[PDB]
Amino acid sequence: APLRVRRNLHGMKMDDPDLSAYREFVGIMKGKDQTQALSWLGFANQHGTLNGGYKYCPHGDWYFLPWHRGFVLMYERAVAALTGYKTFAMPYWNWTEDRLLPEAFTAKTYNGKTNPLYVPNRNELTGPYALTDAIVGQKEVMDKIYAETNFEVFGTSRSVDRSVRPPLVQNSLDPKWVPMGGGNQGILERTPHNTVHNNIGAFMPTAASPRDPVFMMHHGNIDRVWATWNALGRKNSTDPLWLGMKFPNNYIDPQGRYYTQGVSDLLSTEALGYRYDVMPRADNKVVNNARAEHLLALFKTLRSVLKGEHPVATAVEPLNSAVQFEAGTTEVVALIKNIRIPYNVISIRVFVNLPNANLDVPETDPHFVTSLSFLTHALPSTMVNLTDTLKALNIRDDNFSINLVAVPQPGVAVESSGGVTPESIEVAVIA
């Protein structure tokens, strides 16, 4: 059978057969008994629930991409089955090019009846919720993602269990490592992916995010980024712990029976019967073998920089950490581990050489590094590449500062937003 072509939502007529089949599917699924496995809620429950937290969904570890590919495929197969449109292909939302939520999902009605794709009380993606260039920009974000050659950096690193002393890095194929989290989140996860989830509001910031039908457009694009990454020539992890992991009874088939897939089942979109409408050819970017070896040792756990008793980052008082290296010092990364983020804080902004940074400093500032966003049980961690910002600033000597600004939820008084405290901040020079 010819491959199904997952297509960009932009430009689709509202009755486009692909879009129409999905809308029809969400309507069917919402009309079913929501206590059954074969229902809109039953499908979402495999991801997580509003009041129970995450179930099988991985956040903050290297199973992020493969599990969501199987999750999207689970929905895609159900659409074809329940609607009869056998050639259905899940559309995707390219937020890099289209910064607002797609038309088909903001419309309250379709064809006289209420629109199953609609969710009430979403945030309009403007103002503090805008998908700006620092979140989804082609040069600022996407090009950085595609330049990464190491999978654990690109698609988040291996799981770590911090409910034990000392922390236990993943050492088995037990499926408990999938929702474990504890890894270092890459650009893809903690900038465009998490910010879209947080900014949309309603269901998307929660563990029940698939209850918003736009979840599939968002993760269709994430899956496209992974496919695009591979198509450029980038290699997935060759670690047996990643390749061998199974997702036992994580998914539900169109008849309401649980089924199993694994990472190795979900490596090729062509093997699952689909492709994307736009896909580049290989770019022949050489991979540095020394860089990969150093990174691999980092992820099976370099100056540690977090000083002070109870160090904290607020909206007006940034967490400042001074780094000092030997004279003459090429890539520089920062590891921010186990970040306690209160409910009142929506994101963290990273600066260098701006010890007086605050929430009002614009991201066009030359000291701006990146925006970090996480889904608020394991704590989040991330790695931040400072190289580009250091080069842009023409760093003098071998010392600088890292400044973390806690960005409060819109409308929350800064005095009430609390403080962001990471457990450690380590800076390493990757050869």
From TrEMBL:
EC class of the enzyme, as a word: oxidoreductase
Enzyme Commission designation: 1.14.18.1
Location of the Tyrosinase copper-binding domain: 59-76, 212-223
Keywords: Copper, Metal-binding, Oxidoreductase, Thioether bond
Domain of life: Bacteria
Coiled coil regions in record: none
Pfam families with a match to the protein in the record: PPO1_KFDV, Tyrosinase
Single GO MF descriptor: metal ion binding
Keyword Metal-binding set for record: yes
Gene3D superfamilies per record: Di-copper center containing domain from catechol oxidase
Name used for this protein in its record: Polyphenol oxidase with tyrosine hydroxylase activity oxidoreductase protein
Species of the source: Ralstonia solanacearum (Pseudomonas solanacearum)
